[PDB]
Design a protein around this nucleic acid. Structure first.
Length: 117
RNA sequence: GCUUAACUGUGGGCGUGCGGGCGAUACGGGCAGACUAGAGUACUGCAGGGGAGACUGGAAUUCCUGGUGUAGCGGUGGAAUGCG
């Protein structure tokens, strides 16, 4: 295989789930673990417990590829931001730095309209 | 006065008007005007997302291109449509 000394916790933290993609500094997701990856789907995909489970599974894969030092790259808001953060902290990946990597269309494109249920 | 009354006669006021002559010049108005407070013009600056026209930007989205890289992603109160 290979070893990644420093990783990046690219957390696609959708309210649906926190896809914790660990990425080498090159910019390649060496592995990822989401709520479904642990086994959480539907509402359980969006439960806070799924967040630390996904983060911990990703960090276990990180150790499996010898990853210890990771800076945290959290995407948009979801379920279990700080939860996945201290999961990664408690799973062999120290926090390093936290960065809210969220897209900012500064009054740009048009989305769908809305939901009323 | 009609027996009274109803009713009729008599004369007034009334018929508010119009027309003609005569008057007034406060006001309207007409004429001749005049004045700048009104209005309109200049000078000098002040606010600018007032508009129009021509040029440019990248966020961002999606798609497309090359990767790494997974069996999940998104879906909802949950689902199942949808895809991998």
């Amino acid at each position: 295989k290979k070893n990644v000394p420093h990783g990046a916790a690219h957390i696609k933290s959708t309210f649906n789930n926190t896809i914790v993609s660990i990425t080498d500094p090159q910019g390649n997701v060496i592995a990822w673990a989401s709520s479904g990856h642990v086994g959480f789907k539907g509402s359980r995909k969006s439960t806070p417990f799924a967040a630390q489970l996904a983060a911990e599974n990703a960090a276990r894969k990180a150790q499996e590829h010898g990853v210890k030092k990771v800076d945290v790259f959290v995407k948009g808001p979801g379920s279990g931001r700080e939860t996945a953060i201290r999961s990664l902290q408690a799973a062999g990946l120290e926090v390093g730095t936290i960065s809210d990597v969220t897209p900012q269309p500064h009054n740009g494109c048009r989305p769908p309209k809305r939901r009323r249920v």
